[PDB]
Design a binder for this molecule. Structure first.
Ligand SMILES: O=C(O)[C@H]1/C(=C/CO)O[C@@H]2CC(=O)N21
Ligand SMILES: O=C(O)[C@H]1/C(=C/CO)O[C@@H]2CC(=O)N21
Length: 420
């Protein structure tokens, strides 16, 4: 088991040797912090990306020593020690060609090693935050509950809704009303905000249903999700919540697009008061009227709106059901297309000798964080873990490394917590 000096050395060597988009970006960002030029910056970041002042302030906190390095596809984390035992984390999020979309340097997110489920509960609890943890083993005859806190509580789940969108899509593929190689087309009206990269494509860009669905899940691409929802139609997306496991489908009807959550949640306050006042008919009518090119920008987001219904609400059982349904859908798809999409991005570095397959999905919105995994071993034993937080203030939740890291520690301690 690596001692402190061993782990920091291994992290440092791995960062230097990491021949990948994350390795390239992580090494470059570390150089900004440890060395002594607007063109080289602009070339490292997304085209639509103050920063000089940001970097100056970062550098004032050093010198930094690399203590841990956690590359995970387009997401990365570097744990740094500064003078006097003070630790920070550098977080990277990349686009599809390895340009930096998000780069932060923040106080360290501390997650202790978990021995018991009570460790989990006591670590996670935050006054003013509602949380829920649900862990099950799936069996032919129902689910064995390993741990449960508030699974029956419906909570906002952000892009976890894209699990239902995926199931709706597979349902239509099986019916032959849509094809994996059918072409979807990006239009101004169909463009949404990040998470994702597809919004950065030119108007009129032609993309397959397959690659759109891949990015919708793997990159949580909001524009990719909105492209699929547009192609399927809202009625088809909705008329599948009942089939695909949902305790109260009325909570997601109308089943909002990401464009719609963004535009309604952070646009015109009167239009938002109209939603709150309206019944299902008036809300469908409001959304039809709102249809068009977004006016809301990422800079407008902040206040929480999930408490108004402007999010996607589900209970922990619903999340287990849709993941279990996806497992089944994947198994029926002899082409492996569904499986490849579901497994591309497991959200963590996974022990592949232990786990044959891992599905993952996150959701986040102001005041909302969630992570869920389905992990199946090589004997075919499946576990699902569902972690959720909601609050009236986004600062009580933070950037989601906490909740993800809790999952990470649970999964690390699987022989204690999951498979004991
Ligand atoms: O895909 C991920 O891992 C992203 C995400 C996407 C949800 O929009 O939300 C959580 C917060 C974060 O960085 N995670
Ligand atoms: O393996 C872990 O402990 C956690 C972590 C914690 C940050 O120090 O970073 C990686 C991403 C994640 O959830 N893992």
């Amino acid at each position: 088991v690596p001692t402190p000096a061993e782990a920091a050395l291994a992290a440092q060597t791995a960062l230097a040797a990491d021949d990948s988009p994350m390795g390239d970006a992580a090494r470059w960002a570390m150089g900004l912090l440890t060395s002594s030029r607007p063109e080289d910056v602009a070339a490292r970041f997304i085209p639509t990306f103050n920063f000089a002042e940001t970097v100056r302030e970062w550098r004032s906190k050093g010198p930094f020593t690399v203590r841990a390095y956690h590359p995970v596809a387009h997401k990365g984390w570097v744990v740094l020690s500064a003078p006097a035992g003070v630790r920070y984390i550098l977080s990277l999020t990349l686009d599809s060609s390895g340009l930096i979309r998000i780069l932060t340097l923040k106080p360290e997110t501390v997650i202790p090693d978990m021995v018991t489920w009570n460790d989990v509960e006591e670590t996670l609890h935050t006054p003013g935050v509602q949380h829920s943890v649900y862990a099950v083993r799936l069996t032919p005859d129902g689910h064995e509950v390993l741990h449960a806190s508030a699974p029956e509580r419906p909570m906002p789940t952000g892009a976890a809704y894209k699990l239902y969108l995926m199931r709706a899509l597979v349902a239509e593929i099986e019916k032959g009303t849509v094809g994996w190689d059918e072409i979807l087309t990006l239009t101004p009206e169909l463009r949404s905000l990040p998470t994702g990269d597809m919004q950065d494509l030119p108007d009129g860009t032609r993309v397959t249903v397959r690659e759109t669905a891949h990015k919708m899940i793997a990159l949580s691409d909001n524009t990719g999700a909105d492209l699929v929802a547009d192609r399927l139609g809202r009625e088809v997306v909705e008329r599948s919540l009942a089939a695909a496991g949902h305790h109260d489908p009325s909570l997601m009807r109308p089943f909002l697009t990401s464009h719609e959550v963004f535009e309604l949640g952070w646009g015109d306050p009167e239009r938002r008061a109209e939603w709150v006042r309206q019944d299902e008919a008036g809300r469908r009518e409001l959304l039809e009227k709102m249809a068009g090119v977004m006016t809301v920008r990422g800079s407008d987001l902040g206040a929480t709106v999930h408490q108004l219904g402007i999010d996607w609400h589900m209970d922990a059982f619903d999340v287990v059901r849709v993941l279990e349904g996806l497992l089944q859908d994947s198994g029926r798809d002899t082409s492996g297309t569904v499986e490849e999409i579901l497994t591309a991005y497991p959200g963590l570095l996974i022990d592949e000798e232990r786990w044959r397959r891992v599905y993952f999905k996150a959701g986040s919105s102001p005041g909302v964080m969630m992570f869920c995994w389905l992990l199946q071993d090589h004997a075919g034993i499946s576990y699902v873990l569902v972690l959720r937080q909601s609050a009236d203030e986004q600062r009580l939740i933070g950037d989601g490394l906490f909740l993800r890291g809790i999952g990470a520690k649970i999964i690390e301690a699987e022989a204690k917590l999951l498979s004991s």
